[PDB]
Design a protein around this ligand. Sequence first.
Ligand SMILES: NC(=O)c1ccc[n+]([C@@H]2O[C@H](COP(=O)([O-])OP(=O)(O)OC[C@H]3O[C@@H](n4cnc5c(N)ncnc54)[C@H](O)[C@@H]3O)[C@@H](O)[C@H]2O)c1
Ligand SMILES: NC(=O)c1ccc[n+]([C@@H]2O[C@H](COP(=O)([O-])OP(=O)(O)OC[C@H]3O[C@@H](n4cnc5c(N)ncnc54)[C@H](O)[C@@H]3O)[C@@H](O)[C@H]2O)c1
Ligand SMILES: C[C@@H](CCC(=O)O)C(=O)O
Ligand SMILES: C[C@@H](CCC(=O)O)C(=O)O
Ligand SMILES: C[C@@H](CCC(=O)O)C(=O)O
Lengths: 290, 291
Amino acid sequence: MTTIAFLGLGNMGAPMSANLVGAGHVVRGFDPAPTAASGAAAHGVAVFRSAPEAVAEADVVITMLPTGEVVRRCYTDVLAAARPATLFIDSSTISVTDAREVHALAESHGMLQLDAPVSGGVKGAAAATLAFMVGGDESTLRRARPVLEPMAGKIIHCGAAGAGQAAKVCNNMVLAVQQIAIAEAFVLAEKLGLSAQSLFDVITGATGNCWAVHTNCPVPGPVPTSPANNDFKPGFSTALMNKDLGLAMDAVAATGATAPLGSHAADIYAKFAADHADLDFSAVIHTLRA
Amino acid sequence: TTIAFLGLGNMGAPMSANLVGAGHVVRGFDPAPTAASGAAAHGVAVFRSAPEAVAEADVVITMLPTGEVVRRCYTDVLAAARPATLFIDSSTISVTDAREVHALAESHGMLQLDAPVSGGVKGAAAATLAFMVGGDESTLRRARPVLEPMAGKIIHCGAAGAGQAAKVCNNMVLAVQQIAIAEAFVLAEKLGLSAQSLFDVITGATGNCWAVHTNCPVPGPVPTSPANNDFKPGFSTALMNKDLGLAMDAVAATGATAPLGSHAADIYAKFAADHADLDFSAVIHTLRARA
Ligand SMILES: NC(=O)c1ccc[n+]([C@@H]2O[C@H](COP(=O)([O-])OP(=O)(O)OC[C@H]3O[C@@H](n4cnc5c(N)ncnc54)[C@H](O)[C@@H]3O)[C@@H](O)[C@H]2O)c1
Ligand SMILES: NC(=O)c1ccc[n+]([C@@H]2O[C@H](COP(=O)([O-])OP(=O)(O)OC[C@H]3O[C@@H](n4cnc5c(N)ncnc54)[C@H](O)[C@@H]3O)[C@@H](O)[C@H]2O)c1
Ligand SMILES: C[C@@H](CCC(=O)O)C(=O)O
Ligand SMILES: C[C@@H](CCC(=O)O)C(=O)O
Ligand SMILES: C[C@@H](CCC(=O)O)C(=O)O
């Protein structure tokens, strides 16, 4: 049982923090959105007036923030307030470049730091079944594990600082490509007169199977739990996929990589996000009909 | 059952040998002597013409290179077959050509299925092919005992042409996935994320698919994948290019929108100009031709 400062108490940070409180940690919260902070307080987070004050007597500091810029500014504001050798865990989704920069910044201030972005969304966060993809030192992850556990269904060490962000962004790029491809297949099948149930049964029993079909089937019927059956309510929103793909495109640009389908998927989701940000990312199927 | 087997090539030769092995009388035709000889050496009675092979057959199987050849073969044998002969086309051809040759065969009083396959020569020899079948349920029931000794899986996809459609749709997705996995491994490498690390994450996460868990395009994480064996097929780029050509036919015939599948088709057509004999996973090494 350690004292944890938790900066960012929003859609993800609120249920994350609640699980920490439930596990017996003292959680010192800050969020400049008083609605967020109030909700967190209701579940036992001690809310502070400023981030520096929340971090001042914390063994661990978790950030769950919107962007790399917001992480960078938060770190600049709070690192000097924290006790030397405090463990910073950033569970935001941010660029590999930004993660590496904030890691170095934390370390130059005498703090341990990991990137530990997650997958599972709000449902995963509430149920404590998130996946944490961690970058940093193995020994620092060893020190973090007892804090991550009450939030996690899986903790995977991906490599050195930034590798957690990297693994997540690579997976998500692939996921976006698969979701569009699966959508293209279902619409082609429809036009060829092949039934959606029939195509589902084939692909899921064959080499094309993947989560985008078996779990996120973009036509109503074959997977009654998929968003297609609930008006494309997220699920994993187009807004969030578009964010993650922007981060993938930042990684492609920073490395000089060639990612033709991943970049094409990014273009497709950027356009689709202009008007359908609020729909599950499987809703992209709409653009292929009508 | 007496079976006429027209097309005794890379796939047709092992298929027909499994039919002989299961107790069928197999009558054969192939215009390549080396194919026909190889087939006769495993018990196929080879004839000098396709209509001759078909004459005493209860079932006619075609395993031929294209829809145009299948079409010609049908018009070249239909009058020679007995009424209510069961025609099964296991070639990989367009949905349009499949439906046309089905209607041709039925108008001669034959029963006809499209039954294209997945699994390659190794699957053919091992009798583990997956047949994706279009046509009437009752006709598939009649065919089942003939297909079984060639097959690990038999799936009824719908009415005539549905087998071809199902296979073309699955394979278009597969092509997109194999390129997407390659892009991810190269990106990971440039970001300093080890291949084993990316493999461990993606195979435990939403991005998982056969293209990575079995066909992983970098050596190490899946020691049997083609990447560890100089990209020996496996599933050749030549064949993947062929299937995506058929997918682009279907897209053009229907006016469908398939941007990533069409992009993958473009990528594999260009890769096939240089490396048609390599497993399709070798596409990982041609991405900088796209830069
Ligand atoms: N929502 C999801 O489904 C999901 C899933 C996986 C990962 N993520 C990632 O998790 C991160 C957070 O997502 P979210 O959905 O909780 O976003 P959110 O916008 O709901 O919450 C972020 C919170 O951070 C607060 N904040 C901003 N600046 C701050 C600062 N300096 N100190 C403290 N708090 C500050 C905001 O007021 C807001 O309440 C993002 O990087 C997102 O990409 C989200
Ligand atoms: N090779 C594979 O791994 C594989 C896997 C799945 C599907 N397929 C499909 O199977 C079909 C055949 O493939 P293959 O690899 O056996 O090709 P192949 O070229 O080796 O065999 C085709 C044979 O048909 C013969 N032929 C041509 N016209 C004929 C006719 N009128 N009558 C009889 N025979 C004739 C040719 O001489 C040749 O031997 C293709 O449609 C292909 O897409 C191939
Ligand atoms: C996918 C995973 C579940 C744990 C988690 O939710 O991250 C598992 O199989 O253990
Ligand atoms: C993810 C964590 C499990 C803790 C939990 O189930 O909440 C672990 O043991 O790695
Ligand atoms: C295709 C059939 C197996 C028949 C066989 O291969 O012997 C089945 O799996 O039902």
